[PDB]
Amino acid sequence: LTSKAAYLLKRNSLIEEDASRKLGAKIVLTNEEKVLDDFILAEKRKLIDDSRLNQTEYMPAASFYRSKDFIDTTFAYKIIQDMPKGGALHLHDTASARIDWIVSNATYRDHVYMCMDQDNFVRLTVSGTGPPANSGCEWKLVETERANSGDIAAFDHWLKSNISLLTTDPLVTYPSLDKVWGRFDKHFSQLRGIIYHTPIRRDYYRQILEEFRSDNVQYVEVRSSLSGFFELDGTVHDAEFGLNLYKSVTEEFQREYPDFIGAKIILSGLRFKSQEEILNEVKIAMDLHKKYPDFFLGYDLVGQEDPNFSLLHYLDALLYPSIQNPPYRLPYFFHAAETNWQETEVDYNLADALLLNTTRVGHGFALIKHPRFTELAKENGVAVEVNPISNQILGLVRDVRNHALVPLIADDYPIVISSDDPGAWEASPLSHDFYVALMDLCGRDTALTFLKQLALNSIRYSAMSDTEKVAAKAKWTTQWDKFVKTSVEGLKPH
Amino acid sequence: LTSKAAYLLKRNSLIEEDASRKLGAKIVLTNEEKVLDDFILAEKRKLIDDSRLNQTEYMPAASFYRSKDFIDTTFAYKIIQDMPKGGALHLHDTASARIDWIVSNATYRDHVYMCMDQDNFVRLTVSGTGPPANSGCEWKLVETERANSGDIAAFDHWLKSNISLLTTDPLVTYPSLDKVWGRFDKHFSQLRGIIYHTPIRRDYYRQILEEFRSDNVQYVEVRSSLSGFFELDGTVHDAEFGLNLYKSVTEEFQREYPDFIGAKIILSGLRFKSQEEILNEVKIAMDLHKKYPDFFLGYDLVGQEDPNFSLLHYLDALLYPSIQNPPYRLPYFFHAAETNWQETEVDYNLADALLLNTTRVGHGFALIKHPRFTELAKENGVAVEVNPISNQILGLVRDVRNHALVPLIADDYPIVISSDDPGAWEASPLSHDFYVALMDLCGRDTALTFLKQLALNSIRYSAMSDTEKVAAKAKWTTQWDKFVKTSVEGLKPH
Ligand SMILES: *[C@@H]1O[C@H](CO)[C@@H](O[C@@H]2O[C@H](CO)[C@@H](O[C@@H]3O[C@H](CO[C@H]4O[C@H](CO)[C@@H](O)[C@H](O)[C@@H]4O)[C@@H](O)[C@H](O)[C@@H]3O)[C@H](O)[C@H]2NC(C)=O)[C@H](O)[C@H]1NC(C)=O
Ligand SMILES: OC[C@H]1O[C@@H](n2cnc3c2N=CNC[C@H]3O)C[C@@H]1O
Ligand SMILES: OC[C@H]1O[C@@H](n2cnc3c2N=CNC[C@H]3O)C[C@@H]1O
Ligand SMILES: *[C@@H]1O[C@H](CO)[C@@H](O)[C@H](O)[C@H]1NC(C)=O
Ligand SMILES: *[C@@H]1O[C@H](CO)[C@@H](O)[C@H](O)[C@H]1NC(C)=O
Ligand SMILES: *[C@@H]1O[C@H](CO)[C@@H](O)[C@H](O)[C@H]1NC(C)=O
Ligand SMILES: *[C@@H]1O[C@H](CO)[C@@H](O)[C@H](O)[C@H]1NC(C)=O
Ligand SMILES: *[C@@H]1O[C@H](CO)[C@@H](O)[C@H](O)[C@H]1NC(C)=O
Ligand SMILES: *[C@@H]1O[C@H](CO)[C@@H](O)[C@H](O)[C@H]1NC(C)=O
Ligand SMILES: *[C@@H]1O[C@H](CO)[C@@H](O)[C@H](O)[C@H]1NC(C)=O
Ligand SMILES: [Zn+2]
Ligand SMILES: [Zn+2]
DSSP states (O other), X not given: OOHHHXXXXXXXXXXXXXXXXXXXXXXOOOHHHHHHXXXXXXXXXXXXHHHHHTTOOOGGGSOHHHHHHHHHTOHHHHHHHXXXXXXXXXXXXXXXXXXXXXHHTGGGSTTEEEEEOTTSOXXXXXXXXXXXXXXXXXXXXXXXXXXXXXXXXXXXXXXXXTTOTTSSOHXXXXXXXXXXXXXXXXXXXXXXXHHTBHHHHHHHHHHHHHHHHHTTEEXXXXXXXXXXXXXXXXXXXXXXXXXXXXXXXXXXXXXXXXXXXXXXXXXXXXXXXXXXXXHHHHHHHHHHHHHOTTTEEEEXXXXXXXXXXXTGGGHHHHHTTTTSSSOOOOOBOOEEOOXXXXXXXXXXXXXXXXXXXXXXXXXXXXXXXXXXXXXXXXXXXXXXXXXXXXXXXXXXXXXXXXXXTHHHHHTTOOEEEOOBSTGGXXXXXXXXXXXXXXXXXXXXXXXXHHXXXXXXXXXXXXSOOHHHHHHHHHHHHHHHHHHHHHHHHHHSOO | OOHHXXXXXXXXXXHHHHHTTSTTTTOOOOHHHHHHHHHHHHHHHHHHHHHHHTTOOOGGGSOHHHHHHHHHTOHHHHHHHHSOOEEEEEEEGGGSSOHHHHHHTGGGSTTEEEEEOTTSOEEEEEOSSSSOSOOSSOOEEHHHHHHHHSOHHHHXXXXXXXXXXXXXXXXXXXXXXXXXXXXHHHHHHHHHHHHTBXXXXXXXXXXXXXXXXXXXEEEEEEEEOOOOOBOTTXXXXXXXXHHHHHHHHHHHHHHHOTTOOEEEEEEEEETTSOHHHHHHHHHHHHHHHHHOTTTEEEEEEESOSSSSOOTGGGHHHHHTTTTSSSOOOOOBOOEEOOXXXXXSHHHHHHHHHHHTTOSEEEEOTTSTTOHHHHHHHHHHTOEEEEOHHHHHHTTSOSSGGGOTTHHHHHTXXXXXXXXXXXXXXXXXXXXXXXXXXXXXXXXTTOXXXXXXXXXXXHHHTSSOOXXXXXXXXXXXXXXXXXXXXXXXXXXXXX
């Protein structure tokens, strides 16, 4: 009737037309699921409106250092903690478990040594033939140092404080992409000596499995170098040994916990190695994918993407599987366009990843800046592994609401949410990144369809076979319905 | 043939396909324009590669406070300075001239008083009836304080410092959207008393025109309140008086400088006023658009959009022109979705703006987050006024390379670059925002086709009639050809 009423009808048409395109709009919720969705929506909308109208800071989009405790004090984070989120498809094996486990378990073992390097960073290693040979760092046995500390708890807390990235605010202590990446590489060099010892590495991978299961994540796809596992006698094993160790741990864990879906491993090489070495690693990946077709997925090039070699620089090595007669199909999981640049060597790695038939693309922070690349990656079914906390800390974004992949989420783009390296910055396996996605990557009228669609895409866009995908969806559905029923009974009066 | 060569063919075909979607990709440059583009590209690529590979900060992406002098020492900024950029379609009348003009001219006039308010901010006013009526701050003539100052240059520089937003780094001293918006409103309240005096306002608008012509901008569309211009006797004039004053100044300026295209005015109301006041402003805008259709353009709601009323909240007043018999078509230039939020009232103001047949959208920072809104605006031809430095300073973004509208640039969306309030933060009329757009909003292989497309879209998406647009483009083409010829003769060896 009224021109105002006709305008409002057209407004509802347009707004529904726009808001139905977000990822997860296809989700239909049962009444109990709607109860949980309303529970989450109330808190999220209260926070959004309090920040917007009272003109106060929106903590969910703040630095994870400052917002971590705040997140830990919200009811919705408890809901997400109890929620089974499916799979974490983008992880690195050396920083996916608590640093506290390394401090309280690994550095308590025999022959574990420490030393303060030239940069005032603690380094931990394992050497069975007495103190290790090094003059650039004065090595002291950790047992004697802990005994001499007097206060053992303070010593362990300091040991975690000199290793963790969250001891101070990374956005302040390392206020540049270069500085924070230097701190990240320093963290890895600190943990390299001790974490590559074979027993400690096996127990650390076991801890990765346990911690991700406890956070109600049932499936993982872990990137690992797989080689360099050493013993007290000095023996250094090849990548196949590491793959077999991971496989045995995973099979034992699956035997213990039937609710767990499992784990699969991707081989990661470095973006600054010689093309000869990268070709050697590609050949190793081909052999391991042949010999272990169900557990070994493929190959990936990791390391800081801006200052190191491009995908094209390794092109020969990456084309070696395809030039065979018959051609061999080696899957890829490229980190691509993890950069703030445009039309450079870094973000144009997206073209290489798409042309090399990559299974998934890590980050894709510059993907939105390339229209045809986005279209082609969506058409081919290449999902994007978005790691919001990783992208904030490692210098890509500062306000998480300004993340580059938010519009792609709002237009139903194939995406999964993962943590990259959770342990380095003291983050939960997937619930903290899920909370960040819920509070920063979707609109005010989006609470639970988004999270359930992320949980579904973590299985759909995994590397599992179709039969494995169906079985994994069955297990995840069992856990999800159990969680929904328990939460609703815990919140709904009777 | 060669697998490497065939892959390279596919890769270059894909990259050409993707990079042709960018704004201005269809621009064809003459050989002289190619020389200028090569110079700009060399400078830009040097900066980009030095920042990326040597791991040093990319200064153009930093805060305008820190990067201002660095920009002032580049060759590309010199070229942009000499370049006629067309028009500035997003300006505000009280902050489109240098603060130095107010300090060195206006506060040297008679009847000008000053006071330090309770926030230690200098406020300037004009009172022809002795000391000003307000006693909350002791009003003293600027002449007396300048006399007692000792160093007059230091006194005037302190005036500019207490007035300007760029005296300190706003991203540090006001590290919140709300705090920096408070500083912006404080700046406006500082200059309100003196800038609304009729002679000073007239000369300030004249100075706006002069400064924008000096920076090779030939056309402007300025948003103004147009009402409240007062005299020494206390007479307060209506919006028609101020509009006619602007029109007379513009006609005189056009007569003096034939190379100038001209100026047109938009009526801006504040989005926190009463609905009755906004309705009366809409009626006044209708009357002024009827009486001065060639000089008066339309209406716009300005002011901080996050904590104030939405476009829907004013729906009655906004639908008043269309409900008449016959319906009246009042053009709109709504500031829309200048926010980091999603699926809230602020960014859903885009739906109201689109349904109200807005000519252009101011900022539209969250437009990319809404796909159907972007598509519908693209179909309807609604351009977006991108003000990069304003979006950085006022708290929307920190790294300009993470600007939300960069992907829309890369997919050829209708946009025009402007400055919002340049004089507020010591920015050149349009050259600085153009340099920021060049170095932050387009790829490494994009220098001059982008800038020429910006200049062309500035004329296509103006409010000028179809007959006036051809003549405006003729003037701009004359100036552009002179600029290209002179710059090439100054750089080309022959
Ligand atoms: C990424 O995946 C792509 C799709 O699987 C790969 O492209 C495919 O590469 C395979 C193996 O090299 C090609 O299959 C062979 O093609 C040729 C020629 O047959 C075709 O061409 C002739 C004339 O052009 C035509 O008459 C035929 O009907 C075929 O169309 C023969 O040697 C073999 O019989 C065999 O079929 C595919 O043609 C090709 N597909 C496409 C769609 O291009 C690509 O190599 C993969 N890249 C990587 C890095 O793994
Ligand atoms: O296995 C350890 C190595 O992994 C890299 N690495 C670890 N996390 C990431 C890495 N590389 C690239 N992108 C960011 C993030 O996904 C670096 C480290 O030396
Ligand atoms: O006429 C002056 C008033 O205009 C507003 N104003 C001026 N510039 C802007 C404003 N508000 C909204 N968006 C950002 C920017 O474009 C506030 C100021 O008090
Ligand atoms: C703003 O804060 C007050 C108290 O500080 C609170 O009552 C009010 O609900 C808040 N506004 C919103 C929108 O949450
Ligand atoms: C590590 O410890 C040293 C000395 O104990 C201290 O000075 C230094 O700041 C610490 N570094 C980090 C990164 O915690
Ligand atoms: C460390 O944890 C492993 C299991 O991961 C356990 O077997 C071992 O006993 C622990 N070590 C210590 C010293 O408690
Ligand atoms: C990096 O710095 C070196 C010297 O410090 C210089 O020669 C080079 O041109 C710089 N830029 C690069 C490598 O892009
Ligand atoms: C200020 O500018 C006006 C207008 O250009 C000029 O007439 C006047 O002389 C200037 N100086 C003053 C008022 O001191
Ligand atoms: C303004 O001046 C006062 C005193 O001269 C000073 O304390 C204050 O910090 C200044 N404020 C700004 C915003 O420059
Ligand atoms: C917008 O224009 C269309 C025709 O172009 C008209 O039907 C519609 O009523 C207009 N809406 C408004 C709000 O002016
Ligand atoms: Zn990663
Ligand atoms: Zn504006």
